[PDB]
């Protein structure tokens, strides 16, 4: 019934893994800093009208455990009636928080909701939380557990993407990311991280290597050779995909997503809640879907096709996943991840979905375009997708 | 990245001497030419930067380092004159300064060579932090030497690596509780037992030879780990476990609530910052942990509480223990035998602190039975000190042997210092002194422990009015550190100086006050307790009143303090103040607390001495608030904010201190600040009751102007006794 | 928009903490067993219709980590397109997963959803996930952290509930739970736990002590008079509630919820998804609300109902004082509150209690032939979730 709008979409810069500037910052403080930024931009907002805070988080242990969304509500001095729930849907958690907040708005039983994600992978690495399908041998044996990296090399093998092909895309993602930063595209959405004295900690995306060449990319050695022969994950993969003979390992650290820290926040509310609080909507949530065949599920649900979409935003977990997605729907090259992606800027698990959503809200406004499609954790499996309209 | 604070186009003083020996051991002797103590100043950071740059450049010919000092102490303190001028916009400069300091100690500690700290005298604050960067610490077991990190007692934290290194050495809990939270100072023998120091030697001459001996043996016996700290090896395990270990993570959420309970809710930000840096630092590597420690350090230095505690517990105490209120041209007059009149809790405590200091004490009362029970106060204090192991039987027996109980006035033969502690009555002190003034030495100081009665009227009962003087102690005398020296109109300048010397001899702190009814302490403590009783009459819940006192920072809640002050004494004090005004023809405006006082006297609940006050007492111990208290005063019918109850108490004492300075009662704000903290218990985070105005910080602003604005808020809502004096406008 | 209906609501028995029958059973096996029970009751269900599996889990670490909802989808052989998301909202997680399932259907962008929760507290104890607060003394210091056990003691001191009053309610909960088990009320919704060979592991809620007497409860010693000043949490509570002089510690192990293991599953879906699969609705989700005691009024203000319109109230028995205050504050008739016992007798598996006590009301509504039930959870403090269901 109701229509879900986006009123704000902010995010911290992404601090790298080794010698990272955000390594000393607790993930709880990453979120609170973004909350205090929303206050700075709307000091008239009645925080009593915020009915939930939904944060994506893939490794909710240690610094990120104990319902980190509730801790953000308490530590930032929000009303005790603002709730706070953490969720986990692997790489899609950040976008699942946004879509859930949109659905909670449409159901009429929620008015204004904060959604987003946080992930400090240099303080809490992935896998730190455990898991059955990894640490319970009966289930692991039956489901044929294979890490997502080996699957990406498999995709490059079947589809026929060479090492030269994945590295060519890795270069474009670095070039577009440098052009977007130098052009001021990120000036209003990237909120620099400061300490308790106002001193600056980080203001740019550290993982970027804007001077990348294709000769340096070719010098890197494949990144998942030691993992595929540590536990024999090549052999387990080829037992199910039995028609392929040998996996071609073409993914390195220069064409896979970076391991970084960061957070993002999105203010989602109804039209009526926006007028009362003096908020202007920036985008509208057209449709959300869960399932390439999750992108189609959200196209049919919104009565749209590929030609009607102005911009496509696919998370760059691995180059071959983006290339395969580009040839499956014939996505033009100038519509796909226009302002760089996770290969250049990093992939902070629980926050990535909410980060790249805000990146499209701003590029729609900057380009004066209509629609954009965002999707993560893609390639069948457990993917999510969302279409936004600029308003 | 540099060991020097500046790297662009005067010059400080060199404070470190470089000596390299034949074997290749470099000796770093610290000796600041501009002072008798080595301090953490700009001259040291530049000097230590040059020496560290030189250790790295000559690393191929250097085999070990010894850090020594040329003063009587090792290294103690910092440049407080510079730290107290740190404003919020200086946080960048503070952060960079401590990062440079710690980078100097980080290079020295990972030099690849053994470094030994030859701790000759006292290493406090930055001193111990320098010694903690070394790999081995030898201390000279000498009289007066102390090792510790007392930055918290000035509203700071060990910012030069003290928090990170002690946590890496002793674990989170043992570092915070034993070393960091209270800034405990240790003796060289106690430091060896808790791991702060490794070896002890007998004299300072053996230190550098013992260090060089340890270096030579260390390079032979264990070469792979020479110059490597335990936390810089592959198999390091933090004692007590990391925060993410199961044993420590079960009690870890209870550390802040235990700290919230020791402070009783008081707004003192330094221990909070220490606990945060300790725990947050134990979650990351050393160099990241060290940087977190800098950020928490910078926020404390640029804050207001630190300036208040530095102003009070450094500058104000410097001026007092330098003789600020002592007369100038007076000499030393040694004291032979002390006479104490009265075996009550005051006189017995006075006799104890005098005997503990080495003085011969004669304790007189109206009967030998009472006098003998007065000396029993010292027996019970020495019994506890024996069981706890703080004193020997030899030391304890000599202390008790200097107390002589008597009932005879003639036992005051050769007494040259009288301290009367009898019932506070004008004509009793006349009779008691009349029977003593002729037996004592003709040069005897005749002191009186009076709380309110003016000394000028008391001195008319003796013939030598020049040596009658007020000497106000505080119960219990063995723990309370202040003595209020009260000068009558006829009290000479020599008597002040001789009592001033006696205060420092017994290890207490003296303030000098001019004569006036109520003096300073008793008059200001009355405004504090009268505010609380006013709230009780207004209908505020008694539990809220007591919480308001504790969360403000007072050592004892006001209703608990009132029972101990005795409501009978409080009432006739108000009768004396009422008479002093009605005799001058004026009309008396009573405090609304006087109605509450008379009601508790009316109901037979005059305090603790009578077994019933605002609290109940059973088996000689306090046992909960009196249940009938809420019905007597209709408690709950008035529920003001807690911050308003807290401010009414703080402001009542601050304003009354100001009126004491305007009337010449006190002669300096140093006496007002220290006398309010050590005397009546005004919260230490304020820097005193006078610093509370110049340093005031509230939601509306900062400083004298904000204090005046808040006092006018309180006046519009609670009564014109909060209107600031004209001297603040 | 589109009405969300409950089609099935099943749950495991609750296995006690010490020498418990479920201690050997992985929490992933608890969910999978319920997924297999739904197949046994609807063997012709097109599992490609199911578009999400939402499981609440308060300690998603160890056996319960790595998105246990997704492990269940894969381990049980459900289609890869059935998703799987874990969420944490403290005691309310099991009900927040159900309300989120109902909201995903009301949005129209989902049709059939499995929701529920799982918690093996004997293998993953409370607090095992660490905490964005306990590892951060600054946050803990400022927000004045107090464990819910002390707060329940503070509620009893403020509201005036004596040690006999909380024991009187504990005795009531054990009596009504025994009558519900003996009466056969739970025969069709408690799915016995079996091993890989089909052998019985647990068929009843073994935390129950149906022989409880008033004297046996009076002999228990206060449970949180040893954690009070041991962490200083009694003083931290009284610094905030400064008008209170002394906290009365009346809560023991006999009038507080039990530490148990269990899981629960609810099948939420639209009317179209029901007709298409041959499923008859059992209840309807009327309204949901999140606030915090004020979430109960916020959900009544949303369905247009009063206290007298609701036939059954189901509030989690985390502590006796919490339920007693909720009863006195809204004037709840005693015959309408936790009629089949509660967590005191049967246990409180954090991540799963929400879906467990919701399914308890769907069955009791049909057994009594009543219309509306109100289920509310985690009321204490600032959080809290409530839901209204209507029998169809
Ligand atoms: N340590 C230190 C320190 C450095 C600079 C300053 S100042 O603000 O520049 O006067 C104050 C303290
Ligand atoms: N600035 C500064 C400073 C002054 C004294 C001390 S100490 O605690 O007395 O060693 C430590 C630091
Ligand atoms: N009647 C009486 C009396 C009082 C005190 C003493 S004593 O000498 O002080 O012990 C002796 C007799
Ligand atoms: N100095 C002193 C002193 C002695 C006795 C009393 S009392 O009134 O007998 O309690 C009060 C003060």
- Is residue B531 within 8 A of residue B648, CB to CB? The reply is yes
Out of B91, B284, B292, name the one closest to residue A199 (CB): B91
- Report the binding-site residues of B for ADP: 642-643
- The secondary element (H helix, E strand) that includes residue B469 is strand B468-472
Out of B92, B284, B296, name the one closest to residue A23 (CB): B284
The residue from C23, C42, C91, C249 that is catalytic is C91
- Report the binding-site residues of B for CoA: 37, 76, 78-81, 126, 151, 174, 178, 185, 190, 193-194, 318
Long-range contacts of A216-220, Cβ-Cβ distance < 8 Å, separation of 24 or more: A216/A254, A217/A167, A217/A170, A217/A171, A217/A252, A217/A254, A217/A255, A218/A163, A218/A164, A218/A167, A220/A252, A220/A253, A220/A254
Select from B334, B365, B384 the last residue of a domain.
Answer: B334
User: Same CATH topology for C1-124+185-285 and C132-184+286-389?
Assistant: yes
Domain of residue B651, residue span: 519-729
d(CA C313, CA C338): 6
Pocket lining: B346 vs ligand 4, CB cutoff 6 Å: yes
Closest-lying ligand 3 atom to the alpha carbon of residue B368? 9
CA distance C294 to chain B (A): 24
Closest-lying ligand 1 atom to the alpha carbon of residue B98? 1
**Residue B630 CA: distances (Å) to CA of B462, B539, B543, B674, C161:** 49, 8, 10, 36, 20
In 3D space, the residue among B352, B340, B528 whose CA is nearest the CA of residue B432 turns out to be B340
Size of interface A-B (CB pairs under 8 A): 29
- The pairing of strands C15-16 and A200-202 is unpaired
* Architecture of the domain defined by A132-184+286-388: 3-Layer(aba) Sandwich (3.40)
Closest-lying ligand 3 atom to the alpha carbon of residue B371? 9
Pocket lining: B470 vs ligand 4, CB cutoff 6 Å: no
Structure tokens given for A349:
């698990």
- The secondary element (H helix, E strand) that includes residue B618 is strand B615-618
- The pairing of strands B123-124 and B75-76 is parallel
Contact B291 A24 (CB under 8 A): yes
d(CA B321, CA B315): 10
Closest CA in chain A for residue B292: A24
Select from B461, B483, B518 the last residue of a domain.
Answer: B518
* Architecture of the domain defined by A1-124+185-285: 3-Layer(aba) Sandwich (3.40)
d(CA C39, CA B154): 70
Select from B451, B484, B518 the last residue of a domain.
Answer: B518
- The pairing of strands B199-201 and B147-148 is unpaired
Looking at the structure, tell me whether residues B318 and B366 fall in a common domain.
Answer: no
Looking at the structure, tell me whether residues B526 and B434 fall in a common domain.
Answer: no
Contact C239 B551 (CB under 8 A): yes
Tell me if residue C378 is catalytic: yes
Residues in B closer than 8 angstroms to A196, CB to CB, are 295-296, 299
Pocket lining: B449 vs ligand 4, CB cutoff 6 Å: yes
- Is residue A6 within 8 A of residue A13, CB to CB? The reply is no
Which of the ligands is closest to the CA of residue B90?
A: 1
- Planar angle of CA A265, A266, A268, nearest 5 degrees: 150
Residue C133 contacts B where some CB pair is shorter than 8 Å? yes
Q: Give the mutation candidate from C129, C141, C142 for the B interface (greatest B CB count, under 10 A).
A: C141
Q: Which protein residue's CA is at the shortest distance from atom 3 of ligand 1?
A: B94
In 3D space, the residue among B524, B597, B537 whose CA is nearest the CA of residue B719 turns out to be B537
Q: Which protein residue's CA is at the shortest distance from atom 1 of ligand 4?
A: B421
* Architecture of the domain defined by C132-184+286-389: 3-Layer(aba) Sandwich (3.40)
- SS3 state of residue B721: helix
In DSSP terms, which residues pair with C47 in a beta bridge? none
Long-range contacts of A274-279, Cβ-Cβ distance < 8 Å, separation of 24 or more: A274/A5, A274/A7, A276/A46, A276/A49, A277/A42, A277/A44, A277/A45, A277/A46, A277/A49, A277/A112, A278/A42, A278/A44, A279/A7, A279/A42, A279/A45
Tell me if residue B591 is catalytic: no
- Is residue B691 within 8 A of residue B657, CB to CB? The reply is no
Those residues of chain B whose CB sits closer than 8 Å to some CB in chain A are: 88, 91-92, 95, 244, 280, 283-284, 288, 291-292, 295-296, 298-299, 302
Looking at the structure, tell me whether residues B325 and B345 fall in a common domain.
Answer: no
Domains held by chain B: number: 3
Name, in order, each residue with C-beta under 8 angstroms of A211's C-beta and a sequence gap of 6 or more.
Answer: none
- SS3 state of residue B556: coil
Domain extent listing, chain A:
1-124+185-285, 132-184+286-388
Tell me if residue C348 is catalytic: yes
Residue in the structure block whose two tokens are 């640029």: B302
- DSSP annotation string for B294-305: HHHHHHHHTSHH
User: Could you tell me which chains touch chain B, where touching means 3 or more CB pairs under 8 A?
Assistant: A, C
What experimental approach yielded this model? X-ray
CATH code for the domain of B647:
1.10.1040.50
Residues in A closer than 8 angstroms to C294, CB to CB, are 81
For residue A206, count other CB atoms closer than 10 A to its CB.
Answer: 21
Looking at the structure, tell me whether residues B278 and B416 fall in a common domain.
Answer: no
HEC per residue, chain C: CCCCEEEEEEECCCEECCCCCCCCCCHHHHHHHHHHHHHHHCCCCCCCCEEEEEEECCCCCECCCCCHHHHHHHHCCCCHHHCCEEEEECECHHHHHHHHHHHHHHCCCCCEEEEEEEEECCCCCCCCCECCCCCCHHHHHHHCCCCHHHHHHHHHHHHCCCHHHHHHHHHHHHHHHHHHHHCCCCCCCECCEECCCCCEEECCCCCCCCCCCHHHHHCCCCCCCCCHHHHCHHHHHHHHCCCCCCCCCCCCCCCECCCEEEEEEEEEECHHHHHHHCCCCCEEEEEEEECCCHHHHHHHHHHCCCHHHCCEEEECCCEHHHHHHHHHHHCCCHHHECCCCCHHHHCCCHHHHHHHHHHHHHHHHHHHCCCEEEEEECCCCCCCEEEEEEEC
Contact C141 B275 (CB under 8 A): yes
- The pairing of strands B417-420 and B337-341 is parallel
d(CA C377, CA B143): 65
HEC per residue, chain A: CCCCEEEEEEECCCECCCCCCCCCCCHHHHHHHHHHHHHHHCCCCCHHHEEEEEEECCCCCECCCCCHHHHHHHHCCCCCCCCCEEEEECECHHHHHHHHHHHHHHCCCCCEEEEEEEEECCCCCCCCCECHHHHCHHHHHHHCCCCHHHHHHHHHHHHCCCHHHHHHHHHHHHHHHHHHHHCCCCCCCECCEECCCCCEEECCCCCCCCCCCHHHHHHCCCCCHHHHCCCCHHHHHHHHCCCCCCCCCCCCCCCECCCCEEEEEEEEECHHHHHHCCCCCCEEEEEEEECCCCHHHHHHHCCCCCCCCCEEEECCCEHHHHHHHHHHCCCCHHHECCCCCHHHHCCCHHHHHHHHHHHHHHHHHHHCCCEEEEEECCCCCCCEEEEEEEC
């Amino acid at each position: 019934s109701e229509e879900a709008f986006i009123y704000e979409a902010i995010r911290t810069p992404r601090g790298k893994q080794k010698n990272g500037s955000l390594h000393e910052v607790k993930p709880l403080s990453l979120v609170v800093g973004l909350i205090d930024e929303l206050r700075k931009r709307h000091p008239d907002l009645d925080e009593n009208l915020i009915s939930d805070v939904i944060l994506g988080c893939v490794s909710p242990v240690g610094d990120q455990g104990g319902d980190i969304a509730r801790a953000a509500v308490l530590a930032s001095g929000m009303p005790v009636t603002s709730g706070g729930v953490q969720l986990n849907r692997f790489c899609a958690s950040g976008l699942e928080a946004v879509n859930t907040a949109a659905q909670k708005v449409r159901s009429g039983w929620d008015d204004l909701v904060l959604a987003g994600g946080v992930e400090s992978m240099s303080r809490v690495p992935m896998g730190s939380d455990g898991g059955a399908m990894g640490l319970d041998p009966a289930t692991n044996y039956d489901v044929m557990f294979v890490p997502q990296s080996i699957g990406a090399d498999l995709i490059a093998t079947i589809e026929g993407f060479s090492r030269e092909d994945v590295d060519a895309y890795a270069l474009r993602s670095q070039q577009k990311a440098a052009e977007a930063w130098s052009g001021g595209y990120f000036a209003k959405s990237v909120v620099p991280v400061r300490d308790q004295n106002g001193l600056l900690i980080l203001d740019h995306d550290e993982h970027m290597r804007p001077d990348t060449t294709k000769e340096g990319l070719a010098k890197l050695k494949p990144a998942f050779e030691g993992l595929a022969a540590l536990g024999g994950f090549d052999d387990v993969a080829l037992q199910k995909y039995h028609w392929v003979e040998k996996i071609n390992h073409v993914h390195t650290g220069g064409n896979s997503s970076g391991i970084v820290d960061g957070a993002a926040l999105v203010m989602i509310g109804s039209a009526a809640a926006g007028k009362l609080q003096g908020l202007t909507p920036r985008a509208r949530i057209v449709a959300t879907a869960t399932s390439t065949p999750a992108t189609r599920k959200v196209l049919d649900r919104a009565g749209l096709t590929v030609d009607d979409i102005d911009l496509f935003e696919l998370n760059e977990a691995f180059a071959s996943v983006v290339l395969k997605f580009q040839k499956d729907l014939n996505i033009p090259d100038e519509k796909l991840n226009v302002n760089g992606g996770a290969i250049a800027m990093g992939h902070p698990l629980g926050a990535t979905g909410a980060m790249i959503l805000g990146t499209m809200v701003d590029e729609l406004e900057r380009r004066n375009a209509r629609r954009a499609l965002i999707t993560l954790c893609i390639g069948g499996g457990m993917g999510v997708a969302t279409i936004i309209e600029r308003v | 990245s540099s060991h020097h604070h500046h790297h662009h186009s005067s010059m400080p003083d060199n404070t470190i001497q470089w000596d390299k020996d034949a074997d290749g051991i470099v000796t770093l002797t610290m000796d600041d030419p501009s002072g008798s103590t080595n301090v953490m100043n700009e001259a040291y950071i530049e000097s230590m930067g040059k020496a560290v740059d030189r250790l790295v450049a000559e690393k191929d010919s250097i085999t070990g380092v010894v850090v020594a000092s040329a003063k009587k102490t090792f290294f103690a303190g910092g440049d407080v004159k510079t730290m107290i001028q740190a404003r919020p916009e200086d946080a960048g400069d503070v952060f960079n300064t401590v990062e440079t300091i710690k980078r100097q100690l980080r290079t020295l500690e990972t030099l690849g060579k053994p470094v030994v700290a030859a701790i000759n005298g006292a290493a406090l604050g930055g001193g111990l932090e320098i010694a903690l960067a070394c790999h081995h610490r030898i201390a000279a077991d000498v009289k007066g030497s102390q090792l510790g990190l007392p930055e918290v007692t000035l509203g700071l934290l060990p910012g030069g690596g003290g928090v990170t290194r002690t946590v890496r050495m002793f674990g989170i809990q043992n570092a915070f509780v034993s070393v960091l939270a209270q800034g405990t100072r240790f003796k060289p023998a106690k430091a060896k037992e808790i791991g702060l120091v490794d070896e002890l030697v007998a004299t300072v001459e053996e230190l550098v030879p013992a260090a060089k001996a340890w270096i030579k043996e260390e390079l032979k016996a264990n070469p792979d780990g020479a110059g490597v700290q335990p936390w810089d090896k592959k198999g390091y395990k933090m004692p007590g476990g990391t925060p993410s270990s199961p044993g420590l993570a079960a009690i870890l959420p209870s550390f802040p609530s235990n700290l919230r309970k020791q402070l009783k809710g008081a707004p003192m930000p330094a221990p909070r910052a220490i606990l945060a840096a300790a725990v947050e630092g134990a979650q990351v590597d050393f160099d990241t942990a060290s940087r977190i420690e800098s950020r928490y350090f910078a926020s404390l230095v640029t804050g207001q509480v630190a300036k208040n505690m530095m102003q009070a517990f450094f500058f104000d105490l410097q001026a007092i223990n330098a003789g600020g209120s002592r007369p100038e041209g007076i000499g030393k007059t040694p004291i032979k035998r002390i006479g104490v009149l009265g075996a009550g809790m005051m006189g017995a405590g006075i006799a104890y602190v005098s005997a503990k200091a080495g003085y011969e004490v004669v304790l007189k009362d109206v009967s030998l039975e009472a006098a003998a029970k007065g000396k029993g106060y010292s027996e019970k204090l020495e019994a506890k000190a024996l069981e706890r192991g703080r004193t020997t039987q030899e030391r304890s027996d000599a202390l008790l042997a200097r107390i002589t109980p008597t009932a005879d006035a003639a036992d005051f033969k050769g007494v040259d210092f009288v301290i009367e502690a009898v019932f506070e009555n004008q004509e009793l002190k006349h009779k008691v002194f009349g029977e003593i003034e002729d037996i004592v030495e003709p040069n005897a100081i005749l002191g009186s422990n009076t709380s309110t009665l003016p000394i000028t009227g008391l001195a008319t009962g003796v013939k030598r009015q020049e040596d009658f003087i007020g000497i106000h102690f505080f119960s219990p005398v063995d723990k309370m550190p202040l003595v209020e020296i009260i000068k009558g109109e006829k009290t000479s300048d020599e008597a002040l100086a001789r009592v001033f010397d006696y205060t420092l001899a017994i290890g207490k702190t003296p303030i000098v006050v001019n004569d006036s009814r109520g003096f300073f302490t008793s008059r200001v403590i009355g405004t504090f307790v009268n505010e609380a009783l006013a709230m009780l009459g207004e209908g505020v819940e008694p539990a809220s009143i007591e919480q308001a006192g504790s969360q403000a920072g007072y050592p004892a809640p006001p209703l608990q303090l009132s029972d101990e002050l005795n409501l009978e004494l409080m009432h006739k004090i108000a009768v004396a103040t009422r008479k002093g005004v009605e005799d001058a023809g004026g009309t008396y405006q009573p405090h609304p607390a006087e109605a509450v006082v008379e009601k508790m006297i009316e109901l037979g609940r005059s305090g603790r001495l009578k077994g019933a006050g605002f609290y109940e007492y059973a088996d000689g111990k306090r046992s909960g608030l009196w249940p009938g208290l809420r019905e007597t005063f209709k408690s709950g019918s008035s529920q003001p904010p807690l911050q308003d109850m807290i401010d009414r108490m703080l402001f009542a004492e601050a304003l009354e201190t100001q009126k004491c300075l305007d009337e010449g009662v006190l002669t300096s704000t140093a006496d007002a600040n220290i006398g309010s903290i050590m005397g009546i218990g005004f919260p230490p985070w304020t820097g005193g009751s006078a610093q509370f105005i110049v340093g005031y910080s509230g939601p509306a602003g900062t400083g004298k102007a904000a204090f005046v604005a808040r006092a006018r808020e309180l006046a519009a809502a609670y009564g014109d006794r909060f209107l600031p004096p004209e001297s603040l406008l």
